[PDB]
Structure formats: C-alpha cells, structure tokens
C-alpha cells in the first residue's frame, strides 16, 4: 500500500493519507494505557 | 371481538336491591392500628371521593350562582375535595400493578366499568379507515347509551390519527352538554414524557396522579387488609408485636397478592381460619 498509481505532478502525495492509521491507533492506545495505568 | 364482550358486560340493568346495597357503603376498618390509617394514602382517598360524588349524580348540579349561601357551601366543598375534573389521567406505572387499584375502587363503584383497548385500533392494518371510524363511533355511542359509565383506557402511550380525532372531539363536545356529565375517562400509562401537550388541557384529561412502590409498613397494612376481607383473622402476635416485620418482602405490587393467595390456600389445606 504505497499509492501504486504514480503522481504526474509533484503537488500530489506519494502515500495515501489513510495508509498508516492502524499503527497510529495502536501507538495512541499503548500510550493511553501507559498513562492511565501509572497513577 | 372486543365490541361483543364490552356490549355484554351489563346486558340488563342492575337490580334495585343491588343499587340500595351498593349506595350505602361504609368506611370498613380504616381507623385500625394494624392496617391503612387515614393519613397514609391521599390518592386513593381522592379517587374514592370522585367515585362517591359520581355515584349520586352530583356533577350534573355543577354550580348554583345563588345569592349568598349555596355558593359559599359549594365553594367550601370544592376546596375540601382537593385539599371537579370529569376525566382523570394516572401515571404511576414505574413499579408494578394497574388492576390492583382501579378494580379495588371499582367494586364499590356499582357503575358499569368498561375497558376499551387501544391496541385493537392498531391491528386493523379507504376501508380500514371506515372500519375504525365506525367502530370508535359505536364505542362512544354505546358508552352514551349505558350512561352513567366509567371508562378505563389502559396504555395510552400506544396512540392512530382517527382515535386521536375521536378523543379530541369527545373531550371538546361531551363536557359542556350531553347531560350525563359524570363520565369518567380515566386512563393509565407508563411513559408520561411521550404524550403530546394538546391532551393536558384543563378541560381534557387533567390532574395527573402518581403511585410509588410499597414501603414495609405499607406492605404490612396491605397484607392485613387483603387477609381480613376474606374472613381470615390474622394472628394478633405479629402485627401487635414485631413478629412478621422481619420476614415480609416483595416490595411491590403483585407480590402481596400472590403471597396472600398462597398463604390463604395453605391455611385452607389445613381447614383453618387464622
């Protein structure tokens, strides 16, 4: 998943905005768990 | 099928001896230290006042406008009722039980008590409209025919447009004429936040009342009164002392009724009256 259609202009992006959303959610949940289970 | 069973409730008029029997009712054990003192319940007391004034054709002489005396007497009576709505909404179905109060007050009422079910107006789905309109007009015409009558309407949260129009027209027209003004249109439900504000008018279905769950002394008093009315003398050691206060629960309706039925059946099995 790396936006297999190439951009004809440099204004366009190289990877889709919703490609890495699972990793962000996992990191956010891990950080929230660490914060909540420490006080 | 409900019309044939509601038309056949009072096929013949009540016997004159039944009228004279029912007209002379009494207090029946209110001022007893064991059960149901006078202060404990104002709602059923007000309901009994409404039924008793309904019994003597006393809504028909609504007011006098007389010179000085009759007006003052009727004013004092009007005050002493509330501390004259012809149709009462009740909302107390947060706990359990609707029959246990209204058929409790209806046995002394002696007036034909008719229950119309709104759910029959929903299960009929230009012909359905004609059937519903004819059915409801026949219901109201019959309720006029056997006047005086007490109409109970359970679960008004169910109500569709035809019955709403019927009730709006009935409350608009049958409260300033149609000389049988003593027609109780009492109705019950469990959702008071759903009814439209067009049905809470002072002329149409006002003065709501509420019922709460039974407290332990209230449970004791209700148990004693339920046991005494069938000829069973309760033992004078557990209400005269703290005997059965520590065992009884079922802190709601339908529990004291079932417990009384069970205990009376058990005492019947041993041929006992205590």
């Amino acid at each position: 998943t790396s936006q297999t259609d190439p951009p004809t202009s440099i204004y366009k992006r190289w990877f889709i905005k919703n490609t890495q959303e699972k990793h962000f959610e996992l990191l956010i949940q891990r950080q929230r768990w660490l914060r909540t289970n420490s006080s | 099928r409900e019309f044939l069973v509601q038309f056949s409730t009072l096929r013949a008029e009540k016997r004159i001896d039944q009228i004279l029997l029912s007209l002379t009712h009494s207090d029946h054990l209110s001022k007893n230290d064991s059960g149901y003192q006078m202060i404990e319940q104002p709602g059923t007391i007000y309901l009994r006042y409404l039924v008793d004034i309904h019994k003597k054709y006393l809504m028909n002489y609504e007011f006098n406008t007389s010179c000085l005396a009759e007006r003052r007497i009727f004013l004092a009576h009007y005050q002493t009722i509330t501390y004259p709505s012809r149709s009462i909404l009740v909302i107390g179905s947060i706990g359990t039980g609707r029959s246990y109060l209204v058929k409790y007050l209806a046995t002394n009422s002696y007036v034909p008590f008719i229950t119309v079910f709104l759910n029959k107006f929903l299960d009929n789905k230009d012909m359905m409209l004609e059937i519903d309109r004819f059915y409801i007009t026949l219901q109201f015409e019959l309720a006029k025919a056997m006047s005086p009558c007490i109409i109970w309407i359970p679960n008004i949260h169910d109500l569709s447009y035809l019955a709403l129009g019927l009730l709006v027209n009935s409350l608009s027209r049958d409260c300033e004429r149609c000389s049988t003004r003593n027609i109780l249109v009492i109705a019950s439900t469990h959702i008071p936040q759903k009814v439209d504000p067009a049905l809470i008018a002072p002329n149409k279905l006002n003065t709501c009342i509420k019922i709460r769950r039974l407290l332990i002394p209230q449970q004791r008093k209700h148990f004693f009164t339920l046991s005494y009315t069938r000829g069973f003398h309760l033992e004078k050691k557990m209400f005269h002392t703290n005997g059965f206060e520590s065992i009884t629960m079922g802190s709601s309706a339908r529990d004291l009724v079932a417990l009384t039925n069970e205990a009376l059946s058990i005492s019947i099995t041993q041929k006992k009256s205590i």
């Binding site: 905005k17 962000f24 956010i28 950080q31 | -």
Partner: protein, 498 residues
C-alpha cells in the same frame, strides 16, 4: 403525464444574466439544435446529456428554458421526484414514454429537474428503493441507446452532485458537466436591473451598491428582494420603491425584521454596546494607524433583529485579498477579535461578562491555526488538530472568512503520538494570545474618550454608522482627558448630520 409542449417557452438568453460562462458553453448546444447537419458533416458527435450542477435559485431551469426558446425546439420539462411513486414500474414507463415523445418531435430538449432524487447513491453509511433503482436503470438504458445523430438533447439539473450516481457521470450519459456558479457583482447588477424593469422604480435607488454589497446572492434571492421591497413600499404607501425600501428589504432578509419594544434592562444592554463599539473602534484604529488590510465597520445596531440582540455590519473586501493572508494581517484580525474583551477590560475594569467570550473563543482558535495548520511561525510542527467547536460563517457577526472560512481545516490534521509537543504548542499559543491581548488593551486604553463617547452615542441613538465613529475619532485625538467628554452638556449627542 402533461409534459408541456410549448412552441415558445417565453425565455431567451436575454433573460439570463451573470451565468455568462455557462451561456457561452451552451451556445454550442444551441447551435447544434439550430443546424445539426453542420455537426454531422464534420463527423462531430454531440453530447448525449448535459448536467447543470449548482446551488438552488441560480436559474438552471431558466437557463434550460432559454436554450429551448433560442433553439425554437420542443421542450419537455419534468421533475425527478415525479418519477418516484409507490407502484413499481410506473416511473420506468413514464421515462420510456417521455423519451418516445421526444423522439417523435425531433429535434427536442428533455429537462429533468432534481435528478438527484432518482440518482441517489447507494450509500453504505419499503419497495421505494427498488423502484428508484429500476427507474435509474431504465434511464441508463435509454441514455445508452441514444444515437447522436437524432438531435435530441438531454439536460439534468442538480443541486447536490455528491449524491449523484457515478454511473450517470460516465461518458456517454452526461458528457458535459457545467457548474452554474452564483452571479458576480456585474451579474447581480444585471439581474437586479432585469427584475427592477418589471416594477416602478425610483431614480434614487442605486442597484450597483446593492449588487456589490450582497455577495453570494442568487437571482431568485434578488427577485425576492425586489418583491419584498415592493411589498414594503405598498405597506408604506409609497408610489415607487425608494432607497429606504431597498434598505428595509435588505435588512429584513439579512438580519430580520425589528421587534416591538422587546428590550432588556440597562445592565445587559450596555455590555453588548461596549463589546460592539470596542470591536468597531479597534478595527477603525487599526485601519487608521498601521494601515491594516482589514474590513470596515459600516453600521452598528443594538436593536434586536431576528435572533441577534446586537449587530455590526462589516463591509466585505474583494476576494483577491482573501487568498494571500499574511502574518501581519492575521495578527491584526486577531487584535480585532480580542478588541471586544479589551474594551470590557478597559471600560468595566476587572469585572467582565459573557458577551465577550464568544469572540474570545474565535481568537483562541485562530492563533492555533497560525501555529499548527498554517505553520506560520518557524519552529516547525509535526501535526495539526481539528477544531473542537465548529461555527458556520454568517452575517453581521465577525467575518471569519478571510481565508474562505475559519473553522474548516483543509484535511491537514494528523493524530498525535508525542504529547510534549502538544503542551509546547499550547504554551506558544497562550503566549501569542496573551501578547496580542496585551497589545490591544494597550491600544484601546490610550483612546478612552473616543470609546466612551461612541458607547454613549450608540446607547442613546440605538444605532451608529462607521463614518460617525470616524468623526468621533477625528474630534477626539489620542490622550485627551476624560473630563472633556464628561463636561459636555449631552454625551450622547452627535453634531454631524449625514
């Protein structure tokens, strides 16, 4: 199905104004309807269907009627919602009958208004849905079966292009997609001239000013404005629509009609007066001193109108200055937003009120868009944040549309991972907000006589104009003592007659 076969629709391109780009584009279809053989000899395939997309009131139906009248061809107008019934299959039969009737009278123009009712997308967010699908499939089959040389032109009008089925947007069904934009200032001027040609007009009415001062108004809204002004003139027993009638109709449509003596106490009114006068005074001072590229206060009112207890009319600048918003302009607009609370602090001491918190909200968001979304400062940030509260751009409330909108992130937000940069950004935002608030309080405190005089004048007259505020500023230079204002016979009196 009475598809009105009118030989002359009564509408031509002379009745269409401000839609000049779409008129120029559709002149090709008008020419093709005039001489289809000219397109035939060149091997030119005409479009099967044309989609007119745009906001309601822009006269897409009027444009189609103008095309039909100019071409002199039969015109079959029908709404899409008329194809949606309870019985399944009636709409497809109506579609087939309409297409057959159009094919009988060639050349012809078919027009379907509100096609989004039939072509609603199968969103993944009764038998009516099946009927709509069958009618849409019948429409697709009819459009795909069209021969280009038969001279029948299909038009579909829509207000929501997002709800349309992408199958219709494929080539061969809707080849041309023309966006009917709202008319410009010249277009609104022409539309106002056309609608005022039908009603007795006074020579004192300048249509150019109302064309320039009402951006985004459709032709239908301008017609409603003219009709409401005529109704006001009838109510006022005027023989013709005066400029006062135009202004009254404009105020009725924008901020609503005036009430009848519905006023609160003096305490809750002086606070709103202080807020609005402080905002206007701050804007005028920023215009006067640093030559800010900001808007101008036209008039201020404190009479309740519609649902607003007070208002400050702001003159909208040209759109060419609404794209390259630089840092000084945004900082000056932040100062204007904070000017209300600055006025409450310099006038009412340390006992402020709620009436200045609303502006205090917007500034508290705007600086964030300076630091995260736009990234104007130069410690670079890693992620933006979405606005927790969203408020629609609107009338007499402050502009907040300098970059098109204030509470609309351009999909430039990412979820955070590190939480220390978040508190660093919060600290920087608090520092910037406090610095700008201190600056606008220092600016407003240096001019106290003008602010208090404007407050008293607005409290007495219940309305004031921007030129009156400018005259107050001219007559009251900076650092005048307050006893000069307090010694006047009537503080709420202005000797200027506009």
């Amino acid at each position: 199905a009475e598809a009105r076969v009118d030989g002359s629709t009564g509408v031509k391109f002379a009745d269409v104004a401000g839609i000049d780009e779409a008129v120029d584009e559709l002149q090709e279809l008008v020419k093709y309807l005039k001489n289809p053989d000219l397109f035939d000899k060149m091997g030119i395939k005409p479009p099967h269907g044309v989609l007119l997309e745009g906001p309601p009131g822009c006269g897409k139906t009027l444009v189609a009627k103008a095309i039909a009248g100019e071409a002199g061809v039969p015109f079959y107008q029908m709404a899409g919602s008329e194809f949606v019934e309870v019985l399944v299959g009636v709409g497809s039969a109506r579609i087939r009958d309409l297409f057959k009737r159009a094919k009988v009278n060639k050349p012809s123009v078919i027009f379907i208004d509100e096609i989004d009712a039939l072509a609603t997308r199968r969103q993944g967010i009764n038998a009516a849905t099946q009927e709509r699908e069958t009618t849409l499939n019948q429409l697709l089959i009819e459009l795909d079966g069209f021969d280009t040389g038969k001279g029948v032109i299909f038009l579909g009008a829509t207000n929501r292009r997002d709800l349309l089925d992408p199958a219709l947007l494929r080539p061969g069904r809707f080849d041309r997609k023309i966006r009917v934009r709202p008319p410009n200032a010249k277009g609104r001027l022409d539309i106002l001239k056309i609608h005022a040609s039908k009603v007795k007009m006074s020579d004192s009415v300048d249509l150019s000013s109302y064309a320039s001062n009402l951006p985004g108004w459709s032709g239908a809204k301008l017609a409603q404005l003219v009709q409401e002004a005529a109704l006001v003139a009838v109510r006022k027993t005027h023989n013709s629509i005066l400029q006062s009638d135009m202004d009254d109709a404009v105020d009725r449509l924008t901020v609503g009609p005036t009430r009848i003596g519905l006023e609160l106490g003096h305490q809750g009114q002086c606070r709103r007066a202080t807020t609005e006068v402080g905002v206007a005074i701050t804007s005028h001072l920023l215009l006067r001193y640093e030559n800010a590229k900001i808007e101008r206060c036209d008039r201020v009112s404190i009479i309740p109108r519609g649902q607003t207890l007070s208002q400050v009319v702001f003159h909208r600048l040209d759109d060419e200055s609404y794209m390259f918003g630089r840092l000084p302009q945004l900082l000056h607009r932040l100062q204007v937003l904070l000017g209300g609370r600055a006025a409450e602090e310099v006038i009412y001491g340390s006992d402020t009120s709620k009436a200045s918190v609303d502006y205090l909200s917007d500034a508290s968001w705007l600086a964030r868009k300076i630091l995260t979304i736009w990234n104007l400062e130069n410690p670079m940030v890693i992620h933006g944040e979405p606005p927790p509260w969203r408020k629609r751009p609107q009338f007499v409330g402050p502009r907040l549309d300098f970059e098109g909108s204030l509470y609309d992130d351009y999909d430039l937000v990412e979820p955070p991972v590190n939480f220390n940069m978040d508190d660093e950004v919060a600290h920087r935002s608090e520092e910037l907000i406090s610095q700008m608030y201190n600056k606008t309080v220092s600016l407003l405190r240096q001019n106290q006589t003008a602010l208090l005089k404007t407050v008293k004048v607005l409290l007495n007259q219940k309305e004031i104009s921007g030129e009156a505020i400018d005259f107050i500023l001219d007559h009251y230079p900076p650092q005048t003592p307050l006893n000069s204002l307090l010694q006047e016979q009537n503080p709420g009196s202005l000797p200027f007659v506009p």
